[PDB]
Design a protein around this ligand. Structure first.
Ligand SMILES: COC(=O)[C@H](Cc1ccc(O)cc1)NC(=O)c1ccc(N)c(NC(=O)[C@@H](N)CCCNC(=N)N)c1
Ligand SMILES: *[C@@H]1O[C@H](CO)[C@@H](O[C@@H]2O[C@H](CO)[C@@H](O)[C@H](O)[C@H]2NC(C)=O)[C@H](O)[C@H]1NC(C)=O
Ligand SMILES: *[C@@H]1O[C@H](CO)[C@@H](O[C@@H]2O[C@H](CO)[C@@H](O)[C@H](O)[C@H]2NC(C)=O)[C@H](O)[C@H]1NC(C)=O
Ligand SMILES: *[C@@H]1O[C@H](CO)[C@@H](O)[C@H](O)[C@H]1NC(C)=O
Ligand SMILES: *[C@@H]1O[C@H](CO)[C@@H](O)[C@H](O)[C@H]1NC(C)=O
Ligand SMILES: *[C@@H]1O[C@H](CO)[C@@H](O)[C@H](O)[C@H]1NC(C)=O
Ligand SMILES: *[C@@H]1O[C@H](CO)[C@@H](O)[C@H](O)[C@H]1NC(C)=O
Ligand SMILES: *[C@@H]1O[C@H](CO)[C@@H](O)[C@H](O)[C@H]1NC(C)=O
Ligand SMILES: *[C@@H]1O[C@H](CO)[C@@H](O)[C@H](O)[C@H]1NC(C)=O
Ligand SMILES: [Zn+2]
Length: 899
């Protein structure tokens, strides 16, 4: 089990021996931003338990040049000797430190190494980033990104979340630079040559993936919380203005989270720094949180209502991690959702609490719908499943871990109620502070929520029974893949309930469907309301089938009130008809989230072949009266979806009819829109949606409006200004001339708004010229004018639209090698590049090609779950078209007639 020039490597597991156990690291790093590298060294106070000949820990791409043990309890290693022999098994990113004489139980020793390496050159470990100044200058910073397994690319350690420890960090630097790390700075000291050296307050107990340090020359804005925590928003100097909103919201939000969890944030300061080159959206390192400029920065003149909602959200996400993830940490990456689902969920609670005007409560169903898409394919996974290779650990970062997790926690809250939930949370956070937990601990804590507690009455047995229930439930949502379908049959006053595993591109008669129905069973906290009583009823379906006896007995029944539950409902008989009828005469007699869920569920059942397209399309008629935007837009998103799908083949008869129905219907609401930023958030959102829809449908009035604004813009040389909500429409419209497009690219290079840049680069990719599009990709790869962290989204933008899906696929296939040199296999970048270029395919031809490309990609050694997922998805598409394309042709053709 062995290499690196001979000799046995003592340990043979991917995991680390749990014999050694570190407690404290003294970490000294000295990076040079001219030579672009670092020398550095460390001192790890370990505590041996079992006695041992060897000590094992992680390292990767670090050159180790000195190694010593040293102890204060075990005399044989009294100061300062002795030297250790260094054994390096790379294929498990491990090293072995060879001790001269077996170590002694219950004695603390001290492992010391000097190591060096070059500054990294992509998104992980300790890497180089650059930024442009308003002057046109290029500057360099050096930043860490360790999650999940790249701490070890920076300093050797016990690089698994369970080994928490205290960290002590010194950084040496010039004086053009400052130096940030997790904790605040205790001491700066002047050195002989002239260099400075920073000393940071030893951290609390914490995991390696959270360790951080930066050497830049940024500016900040600071402020203090209630509890007297110092918050600072760092950014490169010319963008300090754009840090205001982040300061405001982070403040309100840390205030909130302290209250809600009833735990103070422990560190004295909290920094939020906007890194120019940054792969994920943000990384939540304790006290030093990193962000993509677009996750943090904000500027009234160019970023939009939606942008503000995004920034709020990400800031809400990262702070929640400080408790959910940083304070309490998952025991191992199998339960990453413990961190990531709670943080996603706590987005909703906190932003609603602190910023209800952002109206973010309405938006959160999208979070849940989005997962159902993948969770309804066979290739899905359970929320919590095993993982080992770093590439698998990187794969756990996906809608299941995030959205689905958040979603069932939203289910569970509706069950137990806010006050109970909050209690259970607060307990979990307290009982596990400064250490770790696993799936089961959360349930136990959340189930055993709070007389009874804590110092023998009736209904006190119901509590410990109801508790065991609540735990028994959630176990099934975390270890079972997919989402359940609840079928409801109305029979006078008898409602019968069937439970099924919702599949898609798989029909109830199809040969495969019945094997895929396996042992799947859920405890589904059902809810419902009736046309006769808006009073909400609740019942736990713990089995394959069951029956409820309705009082009054009335027109329709509505299961999943407001969609708080992770299930889809079907209506056999006349339910779907009753409901669409009710939807058509007094839709107001149906709750808005019930509407948003019906429109969702309806179209999702055409997917399963448990309804035909013409029912769905016949529901959308009521949209002309529909006034709640969440519902108007969900509906509108389906027809728009269709159109784009048609357009992607030549299906011009269907597309042109879709276009016509879209402009004809909805013409009233399309026409009330201002080319302004006025109104609510959902008001502003609705505006951009329609105006975009219109401008994509060549509705020549709105193309003229846009092309005017663009012109006024380009002639005034930036002086004349375009409202944010309309900014992307206008830019894309202008981008059709080689003149506008030329101007736009040039304006991209000079902009200081990361959000304007975003909007421009979208506009640039709505060019019809093959030549244009390709250049973008090239520039993207090169990574000087357009940062490579934007490559994936870019390809996806391009591939998305007719003139580009070919070019995209072509490029990805022909460049797989180069792409990998830029991103981990591995990365969300590669995942999004693969599926963004293939998953919209809907032809047997394209499916053929994709199956090959992935086939190829296995041996050479490359396996990613996303391969099968894509396949299943293109399949669903083919099967969708063939099983409903004619119905769409017909429904539309029927519509041109009456009336
Ligand atoms: C461009 O990345 C995105 O926009 C992300 C990526 C992602 C997409 C789908 C998904 O299911 C999970 C993650 N999408 C999200 O919904 C998201 C929004 C805000 C965040 N702060 C985050 N990330 C976090 O809190 C961190 N734990 C990130 C891991 C750090 N990575 C690293 N060290 N290599 C994610
Ligand atoms: C990084 O290395 C550079 C060498 O390129 C150091 O800069 C030199 O510093 C010495 C004394 O501080 C000067 O006499 C040289 O003239 C400098 N060279 C240049 C090109 O400016 C720099 O100090 C190092 N920084 C760190 C943090 O180690
Ligand atoms: C390592 O971290 C812990 C915190 O995780 C440090 O502090 C102890 O933490 C508890 C828990 O909050 C506090 O109540 C104690 O007051 C802390 N100890 C003391 C002595 O005050 C611990 O001190 C850290 N170790 C080092 C060497 O700094
Ligand atoms: C040493 O660790 C083993 C497991 O690795 C454990 O079973 C044993 O109890 C420990 N030794 C002693 C003497 O306790
Ligand atoms: C920020 O913008 C305001 C005008 O809105 C201006 O007065 C101020 O000087 C700007 N600050 C920086 C650092 O650009
Ligand atoms: C949003 O906040 C309001 C009060 O601000 C509260 O009544 C409501 O329950 C919250 N919604 C959610 C989904 O938490
Ligand atoms: C569905 O998934 C299971 C396990 O993930 C697998 O064994 C089976 O082959 C899959 N079914 C199809 C049709 O691919
Ligand atoms: C039905 O719709 C009408 C539309 O004018 C509305 O006035 C009425 O309030 C609705 N029904 C009920 C019971 O409120
Ligand atoms: C289909 O569209 C392509 C371009 O996408 C065009 O060149 C071709 O002529 C069209 N074919 C038919 C039969 O309409
Ligand atoms: Zn997160």
């Amino acid at each position: 089990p062995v290499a690196t020039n001979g000799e046995r490597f003592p340990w043979q597991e991917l995991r680390l021996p749990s014999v050694v156990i570190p407690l404290h690291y003294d970490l000294f790093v000295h990076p040079n931003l001219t030579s672009l590298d670092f020398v550095a060294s460390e001192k790890i106070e370990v505590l041996v338990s079992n006695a041992t000949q060897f000590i094992i820990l992680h390292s990767k791409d670090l050159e180790i040049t000195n190694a010593t043990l040293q102890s204060e309890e075990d005399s044989r290693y009294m100061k300062p000797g002795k030297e250790l022999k260094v054994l390096s098994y790379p294929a498990h990113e491990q090293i072995a430190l060879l001790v001269p004489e077996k170590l002694t139980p219950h004695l603390k020793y001290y492992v010391a190494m000097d190591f060096q390496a070059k500054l990294g050159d992509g998104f992980e470990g300790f890497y180089k980033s650059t930024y442009r100044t308003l002057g046109g200058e290029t500057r360099i910073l050096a930043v860490t990104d360790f999650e999940p397994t790249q701490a070890r690319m920076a300093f050797p350690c016990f690089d698994e979340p369970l080994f928490k420890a205290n960290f002590s960090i010194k950084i040496r630097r010039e004086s053009r630079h400052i130096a940030l790390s997790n904790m605040p700075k205790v001491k700066t000291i002047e050195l002989e040559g002239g260099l400075l050296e920073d000393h940071f307050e030893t951290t609390v107990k914490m995991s390696t993936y959270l360790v951080a340090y930066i050497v830049c020359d940024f500016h900040s804005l600071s402020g203090f919380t209630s509890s007297g925590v110092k918050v600072s928003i760092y950014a490169s100097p010319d963008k300090r203005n754009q840090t205001h909103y982040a300061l405001q919201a982070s403040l309100k939000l840390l205030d909130f989270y302290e209250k809600y969890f009833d735990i103070y944030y422990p560190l004295s300061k909290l920094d939020l720094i906007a890194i120019p080159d940054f792969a994920p959206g943000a990384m939540e390192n304790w006290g030093l949180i990193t962000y993509r400029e677009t996750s943090l920065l904000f500027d009234p003149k160019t970023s939009s209502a939606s942008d503000k909602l995004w920034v709020t959200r990400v800031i809400a996400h990262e702070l929640a991690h400080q408790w959910f993830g940083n304070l309490v940490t998952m025991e191992w990456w199998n339960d990453i959702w413990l961190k990531e689902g709670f943080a996603k969920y706590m987005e909703l609670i906190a932003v609603n609490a602190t910023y209800p005007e952002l109206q973010f409560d309405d938006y959160f169903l999208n979070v849940c719908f989005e997962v159902i898409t993948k969770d309804s394919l066979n290739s899905s996974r359970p929320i919590s499943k095993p993982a080992e290779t770093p590439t698998q650990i990187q794969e756990m970062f996906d809608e299941v871990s995030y959205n689905k997790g958040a979603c069932i926690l939203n289910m569970l809250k509706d069950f137990l109620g806010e006050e109970k939930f909050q209690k259970g949370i607060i307990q979990y956070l307290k009982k596990f502070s400064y250490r770790n937990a696993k799936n089961d601990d959360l349930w136990s804590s959340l189930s055993n929520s709070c007389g009874v507690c804590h110092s023998m009455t009736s209904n006190m047995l119901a509590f410990l029974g109801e508790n065991a229930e609540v735990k028994e439930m959630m176990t099934t949502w975390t270890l079972q893949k997919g989402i359940p379908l609840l079928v409801v049959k109305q029979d006078g006053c008898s409602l019968r309930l069937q439970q099924e595993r919702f599949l898609q591109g798989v029909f109830q008669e199809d040969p495969e469907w019945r094997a895929l129905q396996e042992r799947y069973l859920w405890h589904i906290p059902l809810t419902y309301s009736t046309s006769s009583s808006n009073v909400i009823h609740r019942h736990i379906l713990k089995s394959k089938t069951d029956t409820l006896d309705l009082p009054e007995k009335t027109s329709w029944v509505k299961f999943n009130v407001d969609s708080n539950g992770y299930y889809i409902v079907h209506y056999e008989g006349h339910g779907w008809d009753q409901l669409i009828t009710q939807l058509n005469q007094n839709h107001t007699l149906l709750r808005p989230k019930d509407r948003v869920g019906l429109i969702h569920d309806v179209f999702q059942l055409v997917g399963a072949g448990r309804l035909t397209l013409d029912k769905a399309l016949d529901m959308t008629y009521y949209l002309q009266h529909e006034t709640s935007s969440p519902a108007l837009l969900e509906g509108l998103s389906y027809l728009e979806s269709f159109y784009h799908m048609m357009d992607r083949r030549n299906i011009s008869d269907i597309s042109e009819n879709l276009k016509r129905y879209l402009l004809q219907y909805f013409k009233p609401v399309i026409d009330r829109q201002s080319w302004s930023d006025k109104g609510s958030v959902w008001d502003r959102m609705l505006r951009s949606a329609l105006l975009k829809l219109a401008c994509d449908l060549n509705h020549a009035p709105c193309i003229q409006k846009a092309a005017e604004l663009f012109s006024q813009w380009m002639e005034s040389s930036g002086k004349l200004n375009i409202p944010t909500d309309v900014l992307k429409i206008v830019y894309s419209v202008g981008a059709q001339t080689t003149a506008g497009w030329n101007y736009l690219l040039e304006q991209y290079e000079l902009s200081m708004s990361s959000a304007e840049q975003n909007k421009i680069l979208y506009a640039l990719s709505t060019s019809k010229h093959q030549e244009k599009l390709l250049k973008l990709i090239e520039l993207g790869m090169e990574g000087k004018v357009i940062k490579t962290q934007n490559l994936a989204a870019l390809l996806h933008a391009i591939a998305r639209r007719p003139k580009g899906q070919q070019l995209a696929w072509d490029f990805v296939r022909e460049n797989w090698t180069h792409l990998l040199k830029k991103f981990d296999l591995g990365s969300y970048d590669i995942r999004m590049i693969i599926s963004g270029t293939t998953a919209h395919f809907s032809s047997k031809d394209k499916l053929q090609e994709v199956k090959l490309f992935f086939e190829s990609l296995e041996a050479q050694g490359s396996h990613l779950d996303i391969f099968q997922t894509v396949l299943e998805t293109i399949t669903k598409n083919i099967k969708w078209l063939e099983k409903n394309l004619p119905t769409l042709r017909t429904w539309l053709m029927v519509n041109t007639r009456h009336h």
